[PDB]
Amino acid sequence: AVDTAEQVYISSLALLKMLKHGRAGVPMEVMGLMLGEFVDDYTVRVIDVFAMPQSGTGVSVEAVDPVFQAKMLDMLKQTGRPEMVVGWYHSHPGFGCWLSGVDINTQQSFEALSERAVAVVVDPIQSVKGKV
Amino acid sequence: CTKIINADSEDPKYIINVKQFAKFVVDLSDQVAPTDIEEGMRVGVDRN
Amino acid sequence: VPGFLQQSQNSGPGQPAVWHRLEELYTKKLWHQLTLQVLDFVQDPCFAQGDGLIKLYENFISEFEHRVNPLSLVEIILHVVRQMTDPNVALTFLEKTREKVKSSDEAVILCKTAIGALKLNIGDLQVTKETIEDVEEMLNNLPGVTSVHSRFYDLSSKYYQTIGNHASYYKDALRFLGCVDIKDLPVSEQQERAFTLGLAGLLGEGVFNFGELLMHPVLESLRNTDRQWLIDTLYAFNSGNVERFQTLKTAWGQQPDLAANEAQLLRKIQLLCLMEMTFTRPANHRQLTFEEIAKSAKITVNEVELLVMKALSVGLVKGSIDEVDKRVHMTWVQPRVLDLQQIKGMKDRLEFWCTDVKSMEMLVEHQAHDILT
Amino acid sequence: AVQKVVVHPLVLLSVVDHFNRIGKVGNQKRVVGVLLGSWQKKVLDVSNSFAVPFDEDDKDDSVWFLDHDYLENMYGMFKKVNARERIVGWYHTGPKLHKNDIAINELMKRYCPNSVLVIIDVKPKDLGLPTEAYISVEEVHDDGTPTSKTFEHVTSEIGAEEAEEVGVEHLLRDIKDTTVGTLSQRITNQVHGLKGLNSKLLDIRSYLEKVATGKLPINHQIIYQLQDVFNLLPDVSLQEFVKAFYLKTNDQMVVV
Amino acid sequence: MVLESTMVCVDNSEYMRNGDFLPTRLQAQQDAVNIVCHSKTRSNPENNVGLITLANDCEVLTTLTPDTGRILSKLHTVQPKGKITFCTGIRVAHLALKHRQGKNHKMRIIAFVGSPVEDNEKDLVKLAKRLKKEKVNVDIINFGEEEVNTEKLTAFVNTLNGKDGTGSHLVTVPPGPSLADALISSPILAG
Amino acid sequence: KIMKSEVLRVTHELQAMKDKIKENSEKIKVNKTLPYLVSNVIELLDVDPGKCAVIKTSTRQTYFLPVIGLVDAEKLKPGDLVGVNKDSYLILETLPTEYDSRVKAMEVDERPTEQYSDIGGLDKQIQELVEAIVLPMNHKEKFENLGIQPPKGVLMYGPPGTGKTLLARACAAQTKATFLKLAGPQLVQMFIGDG
Amino acid sequence: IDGRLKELREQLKELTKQYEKSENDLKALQSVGQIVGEVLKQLTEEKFIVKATNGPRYVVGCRRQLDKSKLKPGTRVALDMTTLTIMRYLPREVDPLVYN
Numbered sequence A: 001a002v003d004t005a006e007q008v009y010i011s012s013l014a015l016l017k018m019l020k021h022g023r024a025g026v027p028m029e030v031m032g033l034m035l036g037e038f039v040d041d042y043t044v045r046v047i048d049v050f051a052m053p054q055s056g057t058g059v060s061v062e063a064v065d066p067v068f069q070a071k072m073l074d075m076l077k078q079t080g081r082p083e084m085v086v087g088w089y090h091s092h093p094g095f096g097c098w099l100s101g102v103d104i105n106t107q108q109s110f111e112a113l114s115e116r117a118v119a120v121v122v123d124p125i126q127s128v129k130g131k132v
Numbered sequence B: 001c002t003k004i005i006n007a008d009s010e011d012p013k014y015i016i017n018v019k020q021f022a023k024f025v026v027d028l029s030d031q032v033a034p035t036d037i038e039e040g041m042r043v044g045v046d047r048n
Numbered sequence C: 001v002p003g004f005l006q007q008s009q010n011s012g013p014g015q016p017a018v019w020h021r022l023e024e025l026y027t028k029k030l031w032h033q034l035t036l037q038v039l040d041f042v043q044d045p046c047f048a049q050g051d052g053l054i055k056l057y058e059n060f061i062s063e064f065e066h067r068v069n070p071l072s073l074v075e076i077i078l079h080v081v082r083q084m085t086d087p088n089v090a091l092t093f094l095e096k097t098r099e100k101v102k103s104s105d106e107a108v109i110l111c112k113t114a115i116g117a118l119k120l121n122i123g124d125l126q127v128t129k130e131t132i133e134d135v136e137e138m139l140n141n142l143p144g145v146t147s148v149h150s151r152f153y154d155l156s157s158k159y160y161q162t163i164g165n166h167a168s169y170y171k172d173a174l175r176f177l178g179c180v181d182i183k184d185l186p187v188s189e190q191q192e193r194a195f196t197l198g199l200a201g202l203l204g205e206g207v208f209n210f211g212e213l214l215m216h217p218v219l220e221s222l223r224n225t226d227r228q229w230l231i232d233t234l235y236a237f238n239s240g241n242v243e244r245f246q247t248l249k250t251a252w253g254q255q256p257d258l259a260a261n262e263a264q265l266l267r268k269i270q271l272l273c274l275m276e277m278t279f280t281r282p283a284n285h286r287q288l289t290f291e292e293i294a295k296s297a298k299i300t301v302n303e304v305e306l307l308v309m310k311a312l313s314v315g316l317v318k319g320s321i322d323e324v325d326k327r328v329h330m331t332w333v334q335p336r337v338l339d340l341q342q343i344k345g346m347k348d349r350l351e352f353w354c355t356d357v358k359s360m361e362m363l364v365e366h367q368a369h370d371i372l373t
Numbered sequence D: 001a002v003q004k005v006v007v008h009p010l011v012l013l014s015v016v017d018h019f020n021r022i023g024k025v026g027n028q029k030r031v032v033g034v035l036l037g038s039w040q041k042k043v044l045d046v047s048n049s050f051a052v053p054f055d056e057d058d059k060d061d062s063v064w065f066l067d068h069d070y071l072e073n074m075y076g077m078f079k080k081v082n083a084r085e086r087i088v089g090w091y092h093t094g095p096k097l098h099k100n101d102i103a104i105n106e107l108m109k110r111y112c113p114n115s116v117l118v119i120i121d122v123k124p125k126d127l128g129l130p131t132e133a134y135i136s137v138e139e140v141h142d143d144g145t146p147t148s149k150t151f152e153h154v155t156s157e158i159g160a161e162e163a164e165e166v167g168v169e170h171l172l173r174d175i176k177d178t179t180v181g182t183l184s185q186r187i188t189n190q191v192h193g194l195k196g197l198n199s200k201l202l203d204i205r206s207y208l209e210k211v212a213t214g215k216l217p218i219n220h221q222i223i224y225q226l227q228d229v230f231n232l233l234p235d236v237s238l239q240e241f242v243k244a245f246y247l248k249t250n251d252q253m254v255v256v
Numbered sequence E: 001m002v003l004e005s006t007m008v009c010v011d012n013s014e015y016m017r018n019g020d021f022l023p024t025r026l027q028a029q030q031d032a033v034n035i036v037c038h039s040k041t042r043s044n045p046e047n048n049v050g051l052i053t054l055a056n057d058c059e060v061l062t063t064l065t066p067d068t069g070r071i072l073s074k075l076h077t078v079q080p081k082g083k084i085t086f087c088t089g090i091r092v093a094h095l096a097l098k099h100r101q102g103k104n105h106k107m108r109i110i111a112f113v114g115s116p117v118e119d120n121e122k123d124l125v126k127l128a129k130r131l132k133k134e135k136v137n138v139d140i141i142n143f144g145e146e147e148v149n150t151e152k153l154t155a156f157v158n159t160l161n162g163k164d165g166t167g168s169h170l171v172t173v174p175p176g177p178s179l180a181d182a183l184i185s186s187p188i189l190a191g
Numbered sequence F: 001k002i003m004k005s006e007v008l009r010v011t012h013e014l015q016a017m018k019d020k021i022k023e024n025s026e027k028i029k030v031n032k033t034l035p036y037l038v039s040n041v042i043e044l045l046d047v048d049p050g051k052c053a054v055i056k057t058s059t060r061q062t063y064f065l066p067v068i069g070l071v072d073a074e075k076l077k078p079g080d081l082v083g084v085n086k087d088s089y090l091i092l093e094t095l096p097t098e099y100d101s102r103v104k105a106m107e108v109d110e111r112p113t114e115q116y117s118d119i120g121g122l123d124k125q126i127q128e129l130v131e132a133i134v135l136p137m138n139h140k141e142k143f144e145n146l147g148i149q150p151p152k153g154v155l156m157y158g159p160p161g162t163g164k165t166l167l168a169r170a171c172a173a174q175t176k177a178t179f180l181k182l183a184g185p186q187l188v189q190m191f192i193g194d195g
Numbered sequence G: 001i002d003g004r005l006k007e008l009r010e011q012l013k014e015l016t017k018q019y020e021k022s023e024n025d026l027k028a029l030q031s032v033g034q035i036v037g038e039v040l041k042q043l044t045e046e047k048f049i050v051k052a053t054n055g056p057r058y059v060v061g062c063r064r065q066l067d068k069s070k071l072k073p074g075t076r077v078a079l080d081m082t083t084l085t086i087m088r089y090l091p092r093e094v095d096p097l098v099y100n
């Protein structure tokens, strides 16, 4: 229940994955999870992020396939560098810096799973020239 | 919004004319069996 | 098979030891090492006089073991096929070898080369052009096998004495010289090969550069002891040196295949004697007056028009041709060997450009300290 | 077979980070993986990268290992999330290329027929080159030369990925690598253009000097074919300035 | 439970397609591969067996996996026309099996040799010393005609099983026919 | 022979790619379980320099999906009421069209139950039209193998109360096939081209 | 001989590989397509006025491969769904559909 002026050390390649994934699925509201680790309470660092195809159902917890996520994590462990899951990201063309009802529900499920599971809003269409 | 339904397939799918002029087909909500819903009856739809 | 081994142990001194090895190899069911033994016996210091008998024995062994190495078997038995020396049945022999080994390995393409070689030796009209073209048409997805490539290069080099290919024949002969590096054959015959390639370049028309043979040591050292006037003439064609006396001595030095085309030699050397000015002077002397042309080519005034016309056609000089002052503008788009021993000239010009660029960069920096400092 | 390749400003930093993260325990200096992307119109582009731990031995350069099952699973996942992405080539660090590259190319070309090699200089930033592209051509070295490997460099240019301009502007936000301050910025443009021209042409002069000394093998068969025309092209004739004495000097004097 | 991770490097030399065994020595060695992989699967179906090649290449596609069908498919039509590179083959087998695997999983490299080899004694002794320093556990099984259990192979095995090692034997097979059960009888439960 | 390795690759490639079919299909099918836009196909046969489509959405918009990215135009002809992606703006799948308000069910009886036994008097005529209509339904393959295409147009003329309606419905019941009744006198509509 | 059933297995593999390539083209596309508009005004060589069939008109760019001679004024074109730029131009048809 302690949340100070926390700061996210997000990585440039994580940004590039975000913009590429959003640019691909602009109208699908594609989903993903932000691969970060709580090195301490508030100095959260994210070095990598992955892109996952939103299932036809839409924004659902089962759309992020558990077996597929586990296999992806194992692949990252074998080749690359392992990293924990304490966050998520989502291209949000509909409206701005808030979450929809289903987004709040799935973030509540992520919060139950993880410790924080930060809710990150990234708008792919509003970011055009200078403001992401 | 609530709109009438048009018709359905053999059982699962429902081809519906909606007051938003939409060619609307949905999986009927799990709490609602297809038996209760009949052609030409008004049903509300959850925007999500 | 034991009976054939017993019969085959005869007909040669030292053969029964190899036949015992052959017996051991098929007892333990060895095919590749058997092909090596067949290779050793065929390349043994003997003429293989019993060509038909050894053909029958080898076919006997291969048909009752039916698991030998295909490409190397055909590479070896082709010696016996050629040695049998009867083209009417030799074609059937090559068809039989194709039927016994019809895989897409070196075997079939080697059989095609043997067919083409037979068609050269007799009947140079039946399938000669289709065979030679189809070798390259079938060397697809085969970048560096280099074995049948060398074979195809040899056939087409021997096809030089045919109307179809002269300059391409020289090109594939160069390809043979590259692909096979060691001498692997008498120096005198390589020197004869160098003589033929030199005559090919002299008689040819499209061979203006004709690279990898002008100053190539692998080609020149063969005739370094005999007919060095041929070496000098190729160097003349390379560097643009005229040496008209030596080049005329070249014309009647090797009389066959040169006396009829000595006029073509005249035109080519007049064509290629201007390149020396072309690369040495980077538009430093861009006034190719008639007197300068006369010094370069020892040619008359009316022939200048035809010479510069052919120069524009081939690609030596592409500049404007005047006649009030007879000035020829200098652009070259067909580079060739620049006598790497004389690379100091282009190195000096390049370092001159470096010094000029750096000096002007420093000068503009001196003029620009009021902003850059 | 491709005409040319174009590298995005999208995979270079990803490769460098992959080098950094897998170099913590693997100090082989040799990072080997695959670059994925798309090839559409004789222009090949790279959109994704992946690194695999990789160990080498100097003995004939034939000692190595990879995780091919994990790498293939990565490729399936990448194609599933984005179908247009495909393996365009495989990359190795250590610009001093060794001899295992031929074996790696032979093994990986089952994913890409025109297998290409990419070298990323994680630590080196020599002038501006982030990476170099390599095409495998073993179809006879030349017309009259012996057999060789001869991995040539297909021309590479840094592309312009979309939607990354926002991120790169926010990231840097300090240098402003744009034409801002037109006069001073173009002065800097002239400055490093002269710097690059002097450095590269000095390198060419050094290569000519070393060819003259003959300590290194001479690839003259393409060197003079490409540099003779360069030298003889008549950009030194000044009579066209005589014909164009007012080349723009009229515009110079109206601007004054 | 003590689980075993085995990496097999199989001799794809130019001679292996000969018919010394009934189908081919290549198929005989393939039959050696799938029976030992079957034994590993019967011990526990999640025992993992992987393929390594040494015919001037190192096949890694068939990784350290329990399934045997990928080994059978990928080793079939291996085109046994190239040469043998023993020093590279076992070493790359070491690196391939050095990859991510359980620490409980006992690392073991098994080699199949079926053709005569022309390599330097000094080079292979140097490799044996290097593997001795690296504490490598390799057992080698021969098949068919060869200078079977040559001086290089004997010294290589002696270095890898000596100094109170596992005790993995190398069998001196008769040229041509051989009894695969008698070849793999000792190391399947002892070594 | 090579069959062992061939079938080892064949079965795996079959099952894995059909699994990829299922994965693809599910990801589009839930979008096919959420179609929203009517498909007014302004068909343009744009051959790639094969086909294309112009779809008038229910929300009054036009989507030019390329080359009809999911469905074949042999079954998708220029018309309406075919599933269109709500998010991918693409033709999902065919669905039944609309049967012109009145014709949706004017008076269509799903199945008549009146029997041939309760009617009679004209048994020769009823047997004649049974041979001309019902037999081309049950024994349609008999006509097919014979080579004679049965006639279709049967006109029952006679004063009212002669049982034409019962006979027609009884014939339809015997055929066990669909029966559609048209109210002729009310087909005269003031609307232009309504009939 | 199990190898003589190779032909039947080949037929099965070819039959399904047709379905597999069909699905590959079905999923690899997964496209959103392009919105359809009309060239309301060419404006200039860079910016063009393209009006959607149902309201808004936008000042958009043109496809790189296409040229103004291929675009022309008053011709049906396709705009990018999100970035709102010309992607392709399409011919149009009208039909009286009565008594034809």
Ligand SMILES: Nc1ncnc2c1ncn2[C@@H]1O[C@H](COP(=O)(O)OP(=O)(O)O)[C@@H](O)[C@H]1O
Pocket (backbone or CB within 6 Å): F118, F119, F120, F121, F158, F159, F160, F161, F162, F163, F164, F165, F166
């Ligand atoms: N053969 C018959 N058997 C039984 N009922 C009949 C018969 N013919 C006519 N009907 C009666 O006539 C009615 C049908 O009338 P209608 O169809 O208008 O006659 P029509 O077909 O000659 O115009 C039915 O309600 C039925 O009871």
